[PDB]
Each structure stands twice: as C-alpha cells, then as structure tokens.
C-alpha cells in the first residue's frame, strides 16, 4: 500500500496550517510598493538630468 | 456507547460565546510601551552627557 | 520649546485618538516616545 | 491513542502580532526602512527630508497619525503615495484578520497519529505497566 | 512563491541603482578635479566637501544590504558582500583627514580613481546578480 | 514654595507605596478571602484571622517576577532615593543636577510601578467575580503622586537653571 | 475493513497575486480612480476663479485625502471646502 | 498653441462620445450577444446579424434613466457646447468669459459622463461572466479627454486674465 | 485663535472624517471640546 505507492507519502506528516495571513496572500501590495520606488528613482534621475 | 453517552458532540458543536479582551491578551504591548519610554530616557541622558562635554 | 506639560498632555491625547496635532517632537529622545505610543495606540 | 481534549491556552505575551505571519512583519520592517532611504535619496538628488526627518515621516504615515510635512517634488510624491497605499492595505488586513481570529475559534489537535507522535518527542506518551500493549511494543 | 529573501532581493535591486549613481558621480568628480588663483582653491574645496557628504550614504546603504541578507538568511550573497563592507570600514584608509583629501593631486588621486572604477565594476556585477536571484526565486513558483 | 511640596510629595508617595506592598488587602475573591501581594487571608469561613502565604508553583518569568514582587519594591526604593536627593539639594545647594536626578528618580518610580501592576493583574487571572481593596488603590495613588512630583522637580530644575 | 468515504482531494488553492483587492469589485476599483480624477479637476476649477491649489497640487491633495492621510494644505474657500467634505465622506 | 489643442480635444471628445452611444458593442454576454446601449445583437447562434432593442420593463427612476440614456446624451451636448464656445472665442475675441464658460462645460461633461456609467453599470447587473467592448472604452476615453481639455481651458482663461 | 464659525465647522468635520486637522485649539476650554469630539 505505502512502500510502493506511486503518489508516495510526500509531506505525510501533517503540518498545522496557521490561520495568520501569509506573505503569499498580500504579495500584490509589495510588488506595487517596490515598483513605485523604482519609478520614483527613474523620475528623480530624469529631473536631475533635466537641470 | 453513544446513546448512553454523558455528552453529545452536536449540542456543543458551536456554542460560541465572546468575551472582553483581558489585560493578558494585550499586556505584550504595555511591556513594549514602557520599554520604549525607558529607552527614550536613557538616550536622552546619553545625548545630554555627550553634549555637555 | 513648545512641549511644556500642557502641550505634552495635549499631544499625547491627540496621538491616542489617532487624530494628530500641529506640534510634533523634533529630537531623537522625544521621537522614540512618540513612535512607541503611536504603535501602542494603533494596536 | 488517548490525549486530553485540546482547549484554548492562556494568550501568551506578544500575541498581538498573531494576525500577521512572521514573514509579513519582517517585510514590513524592511519595507519601511527601504521607503525612508529612497525618499531621502530622492529629496537629496533634486528639502528638509534628511534621513532622520524622513524616517519620522514614514513612521508617522504608517501609524495613521498625521504627517508633519509632505513631499513637494514629483519623485517624492510618488513614494509618499505608494507608501500611503501600502500602509492602508496592511492595517486593514491586520484588523480584518484579527476580527476573524476573535469571531470563530478553531482548535487543532497537537498530535494526529503515532507516526508523528514518534517524531515529536516533546509529548510524553505511556502505556499500562504490562500486558498486551507493552508486550506488543517490545 | 513570494518569500522574504525574494523581497529583500527586489529591494536591493531598487537601491543598487542609487548605489551605482553614487560611484558614477564620484568618477566624474575625480575626472573634473584632476584636470587642472583662489578660484581654484574654492573649486577644489567645493569638490572635497561634495565628496565628503557623498561618502557616507554609499556606505550606509551597503550596510543595509548586508544587514538585510543576514536577517533574511542568504549566506551565499552575504559572503560576497562582506569584503566590500570591510573595505568600506576604512581598513585600508589611513588616519590623516576626515575627508578624502591639501589638494592631494598625487598618487593618492590615481589610487582613488582606480578604486572608484573597481567599485563601479563590483556594483554593476552585484546588481546583475541580484536581478538574477530575484528572477530565480520568484519565477521558480 | 515648591521644594517643600516636592518633599512632602516624595515622602507621602513612599509611605503609600510601602503601605501598599506590606499590607494584604489587594484582591477580594472567593468563602471570601481578602488576598494580598504576599499573603492570602480568609474571611467568613470555617477558618478566619490567621492566614497563609501564596504558592507560585517562559511563563516562569511571570511567575517569579509576580512572586518576588520586584517592581513595586523597586518603585519604593526609587521614591526613597528621590526623597533623599531632594533633601540633599537644600544642603550643599546650587548643585544644579541633584534636583534633576530627583526628577528622574520620581519618574522611573512611576514606570516601575506601572510594570508592577501590569504584571500583578496579568498573573492574577492565572465565572468567579473579584474586586480590589485599598492596598491596590494606595498603589495607584502613589503612581499619580510620583508622576506629579516628578514634573514639579523638573520645573524647579528648569527655573533654577534659567535663574543662572 | 469497511465501507468508507472517498472525496476529491482539496487543492492548495494558492491565492492570486492581486487578491488583496477582492473585497471590492473591479467596477468599484475603477470608478474610484475616475471619481478621483474628477474631484481633482473640479477642486482646481473652483480654486482657480479670478493660491497653492494648482492642478498638480490639487491631485496631490485629493490623493492624500483618499488614503486617510491628509496633507499640509487644505481648501480655504466655501466652494473648495464642499468638494473636500464630500470627497472625505466618500473615502470614509 | 493651447487654443488649438483645446479645439482638437473638444471635437475629438465629442466624436468619441457620440460614437460611444450610437454604436452597440458595450457589453459582451450570453449564445454570445454583443450588447449595446439601445440595441442587443446576437452572435454565434441560430440567429445572427439583425438584432432587436432592449426592454426596460423607486427603482423605476433607474430603469427610465438607464433606458432613456440621458446622461451620456447630455455629456455629448455639453462637449458640443464647449466646442462651439471655444470656437466663438477666436472671433469676437477678448470676451474673457467665453473661455471660462468653455472650461465649465468641458467639466460638467465629465460629471454627467461619470453619472452615466455609474447608472449603466448599476442597471446592467439587474454566475454568468461578462465583458466590455470598445464602445465602453470610447466612453471612458472621452471622459479623460473632457477633463484634460477642461483644465487646459481654465489655464488659458487664467493666463489671458493675468495678461490683462 | 481664529476658529470662527466657518472655520470651526471645517475643523469638526475634518476631525470626524479621520482626515488630519488643519489647526488645533490652544486654550483649555477649546481643548476639552476637541478631546471629547475626538473620542
Ligand atoms: C522594564 C522594561 C521592560 C519590561 C520588563 C518585563 C518584565 C516583567 C514581565 C515578565 C514576563 O512575563 O516575561 C515575558 C516578557 O518578558 C519580556 O522580555 C518583555 C519584553 C519587553 C522589553 C522591551 C521591549 C522592546 C523595547 C522597545 C522597542 C522600541 C516573557 O517574554 P519572552 O521571554 O520573550 O518569551 C516569549 C513569551 N511567549 C512564549 C508567550 C511568546
Ligand atoms: O484477553 C484479554 N482481554 C482483555 C480485554 C480488555 C478489555 F477489552 F478492555 F476489556 C482488557 N483491558 C484493556 C484496558 O482496559 C481495561 C482492560 C484487557 C484484556 N486482556 C489483558 P491485556 O493483555 O492487557 O490486553 C486480555 O488478556
Ligand atoms: O501600585 C499600583 N499601580 C497602580 C496603577 C493603577 C491602579 C488602578 C487604579 Cl488607582 C484604579 C483602578 C484600576 C487600577 O488598576 C488598573 F491597572 F488601572 F486597572 C492601581 C495601581 N496600584
Ligand atoms: O462613458 C464612459 N465613462 C466611463 C468611465 C469609465 C470607464 C471604464 C474604463 Cl475607461 C476602463 C475600465 C472600466 C471602466 O468603467 C468603470 F466604471 F471604471 F468600471 C468607461 C466609461 N465610459
Ligand atoms: C459630508 C456631508 C455628506 C452629506 C450626505 C447626506 C446624505 C443624504 C442621504 C439621505 C437619504 C435618506 C433616505 C431615506
Ligand atoms: C517574605 C519577605 C518579606 C519582604 C518584605 C520587605 C519589603 C518591605 C518594603 C521594602 C521597601 C524599602
Ligand atoms: C431610439 C432613438 C435613438 C436616439 C439616438 C439619438 C442620439 C444620438 C446622439 C445625439 C447627440 C447630439
Ligand atoms: C505643574 C504641575 C503639574 C500638574 C498636572 C500634571 C499631571 C501629570
Ligand atoms: C487631470 C490630468 C491633467 C494633467 C495635464 C493637465 C495639463 C496642464
């Protein structure tokens, strides 16, 4: 049953899924923030090259 | 076994009641508050002693 | 400066109600108190 | 396998940061320190936004308390706006998940099967003195 | 597969553009300084003051990079970033004046030119490595 | 004018914070037992009068700190030190820094006191109804008196430093 | 052995990248942007009949007002204060 | 310089907002039917090509306002009036108030447009998946163009009033 | 302190909608009202 199982027993031991928000759940706002800082740096260099 | 059972699962399945947040839940932030105040006094004295000389 | 005892009680009251005042601390040791009281009131 | 019914424990110290995972808290700390540095660099390419006076602005904007000063250039205002959005979303998420924690309580058994009870070893498990069970295990 | 290490990688990627621009300005300042009455003294004093103010952020930001990697547990990259942190701690720098420079238009000028070029090369290489690490950690999902 | 007020505040606060911890009428709970910080005593029961101590056995840190009630003890110590510093400012006058030292001692007293009560109330709950006695409110009144005399001590120091 | 249930294995159900904005529909998230542009232009219009409320400054104020943060500047005329108050109520 | 830009914006916005309402490719929904503001048409079914109108029978106010799609019609009218006012500023010049009138018309156009879409999307939902066509996005682009030409018209008015 | 009727209405409305107040009362009796309305 087990020692020849095709699907195998990967992660056979139970892991207690916590009910706290995981970083994979609010990753969108982090992508937005890092993109915003990248854009701000681009604009701030354009202004300095302007003068 | 179940019909002559002292307790039943369905009756207390939800039985949900909510209680006021006791000081035990929160005191982890009162500790941080007083720690921050002590630290602020400490750095104030350090800056004062450094600026006096 | 402006942070007498009355202004200080006013600032701290304002900071708890998350309203915020016109005066703010301008020194390191006066900004640590503000930051920690802000975090506490947020929680 | 017989265990005591899992009942709610005493809420520990530092429980207030349960509604958000540890990784999220660390990312919040380093996002704040990244935003303040970038705001400083932006206001010092093109202006009292020194590092000390910009860390205070970022912290003030996160804790919902009103900001003392506001960026005037375009490139400072982009940073200000995106960090405002970020703080709004994070605070809403924390409040909502905490409400979920308080409303419906969900208890989990610390141990599920003997295959994991052997691995745990922080929980002491015992038999009767001598009989079918002890002889079976030996 | 968003992870703390991945976020630190992106944030380093954003800050590394600034870390490059600092060394580019240092290169331009050296070149404008080497090629030479009281107006000359004023010009060299202004350049020296500019360089003295520009030195510290270039070190503090790299301190952030190494600190973020330490706190995020990425040792293969922290090992790469340690040697520059140590050089940035004035290991080879003597104790003569607080600023980099006294005109100091001598072999010290060539030494700072060469080390600035080396620092720019290191910064750009590290930038590309950070971009690759970010893409690897995210796209692997 | 104000130095006398600071002295009377210092010793009143120390008196109240040394009466708060020694005596045992903090918590009323159930027969009705008028508890304390060190000793629990019984009322309206088979036994009365004479009474017994508390048993206090990383939540171990809470248990030991509540047991060895260090923070109110330290609050009392700090209030006493502030009192003697204000006393020593009158003699050897114009020190200009002993009064500021008093102003810091009378505030660290408040901070240690508030930690003491947070810890005590946190450990207490470790349904039934309870209530608080007069030892508890002497502690609470000592905190207020300590903070007020602290602000008065800093005020005196500032006035005496501007007079120079 | 015995008669036993058999059900489809629940998947991991990884959340979307931009799942933080589910609680409001897409139409709301875009009418917010469009109302923000509308308010930023009307506040400019009203302030500019003939101070500090240019167009860029007005867009900055209205952005700040949506995110509950609020800026250093604030409208100082009746017909700018009406726009401010209504946009405040909407964002609340 | 800027008056020409305001004119081209005015007539482009009017063109887009009169193409948005007349044509019928607003909403795609289910066979797949490319809907419209007035007429619904069928695609990939037993019937195709020729198509039929919408049936619209105090929620009655929503039904009638959505049916008699007044707000986009009024947006088109206002954009046209702003266009003719900017045209009439070039002749009979130095009126100093026709341009401000244009600046108000081009903004009331945006407001009526946004009410039009709020009403349309509110009535639309009165499960199945839907999508939006190119008539919808012409409407949305007309709004943006209207607001921008409005701010340009006020800018011109302010410049021409400061020049006097 | 200005706090005329038109400006006091703006301060109260600003304090209700959680948006930062432009000015703050300086007197004592002007500050009790502010604190109560904030709560
Ligand atoms: C007077 C000064 C500080 C207060 C001192 C507290 C002593 C009395 C409380 C005793 C106690 O319960 O210990 C507890 C708290 O113990 C702590 O260490 C509290 C942390 C606050 C210190 C300063 C915070 C940061 C400073 C400002 C930053 C800017 C045990 O805590 P623990 O050891 O961390 O174990 C984790 C507990 N857990 C298992 C439930 C998670
Ligand atoms: O034949 C046997 N039948 C048994 C039946 C039972 C039970 F089913 F419970 F009645 C029990 N118990 C197990 C614990 O609860 C109380 C007594 C023991 C039995 N034993 C001794 P073992 O060797 O310890 O199993 C036997 O020898
Ligand atoms: O040494 C002491 N420090 C103290 C601090 C506060 C109080 C207190 C009072 Cl005075 C009235 C009502 C509740 C109180 O306790 C509270 F924590 F606030 F709930 C008692 C104290 N004793
Ligand atoms: O006449 C018109 N006014 C309009 C206003 C907005 C939009 C729109 C756009 Cl452009 C893109 C995406 C969603 C949109 O509608 C929204 F309400 F925002 F959901 C379309 C419009 N058409
Ligand atoms: C900031 C001021 C906002 C004013 C909003 C007024 C709301 C009026 C709604 C009345 C609806 C009554 C339905 C019975
Ligand atoms: C059981 C040990 C009793 C300890 C009590 C001594 C503390 C009294 C107050 C001391 C403050 C100076
Ligand atoms: C059912 C009658 C159709 C009416 C459509 C006429 C409106 C077209 C645009 C008018 C704007 C000037
Ligand atoms: C100047 C004396 C202070 C009176 C009130 C202080 C309360 C902390
Ligand atoms: C509402 C957006 C306006 C941006 C350009 C305005 C021209 C001055």
Residue nearest to atom 9 of ligand 6 (CA): F18
To which residue do tokens 């105040």 refer?
Answer: B37
Helix spans in chain E (H): 4-34, 38-72, 75-88, 107-139
Task: Answer for the pair D79, A37: CB distance below 8 angstroms, yes or no.
Answer: yes
Q: What's the CA gap between B25 and D10, in Å, rounded?
A: 9
Give bridge partners of residue H39 from the DSSP assignment.
Answer: H53
Widest pairwise Cα distance in chain E: 64
Q: How big is chain C by its Cα radius of gyration, in Å?
A: 10
Q: Is the CB of H75 under 6 A from ligand 7?
A: no
Q: What's the CA gap between A33 and D36, in Å, rounded?
A: 12
Nearest one of B21, I39, C16 to D63, comparing CA atoms: C16
Q: How far is CA A3 from CA A8, C19, E102, G1, in A?
A: 8, 64, 79, 20
E strands, D1-138, are none
Who contacts G56 (Cβ-Cβ below 8 Å, separation ≥6)?
Answer: D74
Who contacts G30 (Cβ-Cβ below 8 Å, separation ≥6)?
Answer: none
Q: Does D60 touch chain C (CB under 8 A)?
A: yes
CATH number of the CATH domain containing H32: 1.20.140.150
Nearest one of F109, H17, H77, A21 to D24, comparing CA atoms: A21
Partner residue opposite G92 with nearest CB, options I6, I18, I22:
I18
Nearest one of H126, H128, H123, H2 to H72, comparing CA atoms: H123
**Which ligand is the nearest neighbour of the Cα of G85?**
5
Residue F131 phi/psi, 5° resolution? -160, 165
Closest atom of ligand 8 to CA, residue C9: 8
- Give I-chain residues touching G85 at CB under 8 angstroms: 13, 17
- Give D-chain residues touching G64 at CB under 8 angstroms: 70, 84
Residue nearest to atom 26 of ligand 2 (CA): D132
Sign of CA dihedral F138, F144, F150, F152: negative
Nearest one of F34, F36, F31, F35 to F47, comparing CA atoms: F31
The SS3 call for residue E102 is coil
Nearest-Cα distance to chain C for I11, in Å, is 12
What is the distance of C-alpha D26 from the center of its chain?
8
Partner residue opposite B26 with nearest CB, options D10, D16, D104:
D16
CA of F152 to the centre of ligand 8 (A): 7
Task: Answer for the pair H78, H92: CB distance below 8 angstroms, yes or no.
Answer: no
Q: What's the CA gap between F116 and F106, in Å, rounded?
A: 15
Probe site for chain G from D27, D48, D67, D69 (most G CB atoms < 10 A):
D67
- Give I-chain residues touching C10 at CB under 8 angstroms: 24, 31
- Give F-chain residues touching B24 at CB under 8 angstroms: 122, 125
The SS3 call for residue A31 is helix
Q: Is the CB of H20 under 6 A from ligand 4?
A: yes
Nearest one of H119, H153, H131 to H13, comparing CA atoms: H153
Residue nearest to atom 5 of ligand 9 (CA): H148
Task: Answer for the pair H120, H66: CB distance below 8 angstroms, yes or no.
Answer: yes
Task: Answer for the pair E61, E18: CB distance below 8 angstroms, yes or no.
Answer: yes
Buried b (16+ CB within 10 A) or exposed e, E39-73: eeeeebeebbeebeebbebbeebbebbbbbbeebe
Q: Is the CB of F74 under 6 A from ligand 8?
A: no
Binding residue per annotation — D132? yes
Q: What's the CA gap between F50 and A40, in Å, rounded?
A: 74
Query: Are residues E2 and A37, on separate chains, in Cβ contact within 8 Å?
Result: no
The enclosing H or E element of F159 equals: helix F135-162
**Tokens for A42?**
């681009």
Q: Angle of helix A27-50 relative to helix D74-103, nearest 10 degrees? A: 170
DSSP state of D18: -
DSSP state of D11: P
Give bridge partners of residue H52 from the DSSP assignment.
Answer: H40
Give bridge partners of residue A21 from the DSSP assignment.
Answer: D20
Q: What's the CA gap between F85 and F88, in Å, rounded?
A: 5
* Chains with ≥3 CB–CB distances under 8 Å to E: A, D
Query: Are residues G88 and I13, on separate chains, in Cβ contact within 8 Å?
Result: yes
Q: What's the CA gap between A10 and F115, in Å, rounded?
A: 49
Who contacts E117 (Cβ-Cβ below 8 Å, separation ≥6)?
Answer: E27
Q: Does D23 touch chain A (CB under 8 A)?
A: yes
Q: What's the CA gap between F23 and F134, in Å, rounded?
A: 10
Q: What's the CA gap between F120 and F22, in Å, rounded?
A: 15
Query: Are residues B34 and F107, on separate chains, in Cβ contact within 8 Å?
Result: no
**Domain region containing F67:** 2-163
> What determination technique applies here?
cryo-EM
- Give A-chain residues touching D101 at CB under 8 angstroms: 19
Q: What secondary structure, in 3-state letters, does F44-105 show?
A: CCCCCCCCEECCCCCCHHHHHHHHCCHHHHHHHHHHHHHHHHHHHHHCCCCCCCHHHHHHHH
Q: What's the CA gap between D53 and D44, in Å, rounded?
A: 12
The SS3 call for residue F34 is strand
**Domain region containing E5:** 1-141
Q: What's the CA gap between H34 and H132, in Å, rounded?
A: 9
Q: What's the CA gap between A9 and B19, in Å, rounded?
A: 42
Q: What's the CA gap between F82 and F101, in Å, rounded?
A: 7
- What lines the ligand 9 site, CB under 6 Å? G 37, 41, 55; H 147-148, 151-152, 155
Q: Say how many CA atoms lie within 13 Å of G46 toward its Cβ.
A: 18
**Tokens for F19?**
């009466």
Nearest one of F35, F10, F29 to F136, comparing CA atoms: F35
Q: What's the CA gap between G56 and G47, in Å, rounded?
A: 13
Q: What's the CA gap between H36 and H145, in Å, rounded?
A: 22
The SS3 call for residue D25 is helix
Nearest one of F104, F150, F146 to F12, comparing CA atoms: F146
Sign of CA dihedral H112, H118, H123, H128: positive
Q: Say how many CA atoms lie within 13 Å of D83 toward its Cβ.
A: 34
Task: Answer for the pair E71, D26: CB distance below 8 angstroms, yes or no.
Answer: yes
Q: Is the CB of B26 under 6 A from ligand 1?
A: no
The enclosing H or E element of F28 equals: strand F27-29
Q: What is the DSSP string of C18-30?
A: T---S----SHHH
- From G85, G88, G92, the mutation candidate for ligand 5 (largest count of ligand atoms within 8 A of CB) is G85
Nearest one of F154, F140, F156 to F13, comparing CA atoms: F140
Q: What's the CA gap between G88 and G82, in Å, rounded?
A: 10
Q: What is the DSSP string of H13-73?
A: HHHHHHHHHHS--SEEE---EE--SSEE---SSSS-SS-EE-----THHHHHHHHTTHHHH
Question: After which residues are there C–N gaps above 2.5 Å in chain E?
Answer: 36, 101
Burial of F97 (0-12, 13-18, 19+ CB in 10 A): exposed
Residue H34 phi/psi, 5° resolution? -80, 105
Nearest one of F142, F143, F109, F156 to F4, comparing CA atoms: F156
To which residue do tokens 């030996």 refer?
Answer: D138
To which residue do tokens 């056995």 refer?
Answer: F57
Tell me how many residue pairs between chain G and chain I have CB atoms under 8 A apart: 23
Q: What's the CA gap between H71 and H85, in Å, rounded?
A: 21
Probe site for chain G from A7, A17, A28 (most G CB atoms < 10 A):
A28
Partner residue opposite D88 with nearest CB, options G67, G70, G72:
G67
Angle F37-F39-F41 from CA coordinates, rounded to 5°:
120
The enclosing H or E element of F33 equals: strand F33-34
For D83, nearest residue in chain G (alpha carbons):
G67
Q: Does D59 touch chain C (CB under 8 A)?
A: yes
Q: What's the CA gap between A3 and A24, in Å, rounded?
A: 34
Nearest one of F45, G27, D80, E129 to A44, comparing CA atoms: D80
* Chains with ≥3 CB–CB distances under 8 Å to G: A, D, H, I
DSSP state of G90: H
The SS3 call for residue F132 is strand
Nearest one of H161, H146, H151, H82 to G44, comparing CA atoms: H151
Q: What's the CA gap between C21 and C34, in Å, rounded?
A: 12
What is the distance of C-alpha F110 from the center of its chain?
8
Domain count of the fold of chain F: 1
């Amino acid at each position: 049953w087990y020692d020849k199982g095709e699907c195998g027993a990967a992660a056979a031991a139970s892991k207690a899924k916590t009910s706290a928000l995981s970083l994979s759940n609010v990753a969108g706002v982090f992508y937005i923030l890092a993109g915003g800082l990248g854009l701000a740096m681009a604009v701030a260099l354009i202004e300095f090259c302007y003068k | 076994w179940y019909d002559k059972g002292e307790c039943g699962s369905g009756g207390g399945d939800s039985k949900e009641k909510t209680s006021a947040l006791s000081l035990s839940n929160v005191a982890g932030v009162f500790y941080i508050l007083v720690g921050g105040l002590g630290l602020a006094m400490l750095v104030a004295l350090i800056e004062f002693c450094y600026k006096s000389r | 400066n402006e942070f007498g005892i009355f202004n200080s009680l006013w600032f701290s009251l304002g900071a708890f109600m998350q309203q915020g005042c016109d005066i703010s601390p301008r020194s390191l040791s006066g900004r640590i108190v503000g930051g920690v009281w802000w975090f506490f009131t947020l929680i | 396998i017989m265990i005591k019914k899992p009942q709610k424990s005493k809420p520990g110290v530092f429980s207030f940061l349960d509604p958000l995972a540890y990784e999220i808290w660390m990312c919040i700390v380093f996002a704040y320190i990244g935003v303040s540095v970038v705001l400083f660099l932006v206001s010092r390419f093109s202006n009292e936004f020194g590092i000390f006076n910009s860390l205070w602005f970022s912290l003030g904007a996160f804790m919902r308390q009103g900001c003392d000063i506001s960026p005037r250039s375009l490139s400072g205002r982009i940073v200000g706006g995106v960090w405002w959005f970020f703080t709004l979303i994070i605070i809403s998420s924390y409040t909502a998940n905490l409400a979920a924690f308080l409303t419906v309580e969900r208890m989990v058994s610390p141990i599920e099967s003997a295959e994991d009870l052997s691995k745990q070893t922080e929980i002491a498990y015992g038999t009767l003195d001598s009989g079918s069970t002890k002889e079976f295990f030996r | 597969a968003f992870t703390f290490a991945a976020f630190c990688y992106m944030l380093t990627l954003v800050l590394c553009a600034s870390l490059i621009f600092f060394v580019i300005w240092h290169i331009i300042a050296f070149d404008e300084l080497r090629t030479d009455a009281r107006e000359r003294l004023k010009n060299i004093e202004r350049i020296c003051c500019l360089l003295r103010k520009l030195v510290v952020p270039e070190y503090s930001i790299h301190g952030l990079f190494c600190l973020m990697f330490l706190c995020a547990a990425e040792w293969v990259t922290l090992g790469l970033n340690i040697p520059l942190l140590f050089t940035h701690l004035w290991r080879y720098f003597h104790r003569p004046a607080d600023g980099s420079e006294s005109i100091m238009n001598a072999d010290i000028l060539n030494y700072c030119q060469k080390e600035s070029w080396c620092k720019l090369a290191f910064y750009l290489l590290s930038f590309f490595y950070y971009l690759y690490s970010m893409v690897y950690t995210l796209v692997s999902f | 004018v104000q130095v006398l007020l600071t002295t009377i505040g210092a010793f009143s606060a120390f008196g109240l914070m040394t009466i708060a911890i020694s005596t045992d009428y903090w918590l009323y709970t159930r027969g009705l037992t008028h508890s304390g910080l060190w000793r629990i005593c019984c009322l309206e029961g088979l036994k009365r009068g004479v009474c017994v101590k508390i048993n206090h056995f990383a939540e171990y840190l809470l248990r030991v700190v509540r047991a060895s009630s260090i923070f109110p003890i330290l609050s009392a110590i700090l209030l006493l030190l502030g009192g003697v510093c204000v006393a020593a400012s009158r003699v050897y006058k114009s020190k200009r820094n002993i009064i500021l030292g008093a102003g810091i001692l009378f505030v660290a007293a408040g901070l240690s006191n508030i930690i003491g009560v947070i810890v005590y109330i946190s450990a207490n709950a470790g349904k039934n109804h309870y209530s608080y006695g007069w030892s508890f409110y002497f502690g609470g009144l000592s905190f207020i008196l300590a903070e007020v005399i602290g602000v008065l001590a800093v005020n005196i120091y500032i006035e005496r430093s501007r007079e120079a | 052995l015995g008669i036993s249930i058999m059900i489809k294995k629940p998947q991991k159900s990884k959340p979307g990248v931009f799942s933080f904005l589910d609680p409001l529909a897409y139409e709301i998230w875009m009418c917010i942007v469009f109302a923000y542009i509308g308010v930023s232009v009307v506040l400019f219009l009203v302030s500019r009949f003939s101070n500090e409320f240019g167009i860029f400054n007005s867009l900055w104020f209205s952005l700040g007002a949506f995110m509950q943060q609020g800026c250093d500047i604030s409208p100082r005329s009746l017909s700018g204060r009406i726009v401010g108050g209504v946009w405040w109520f909407f964002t609340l």
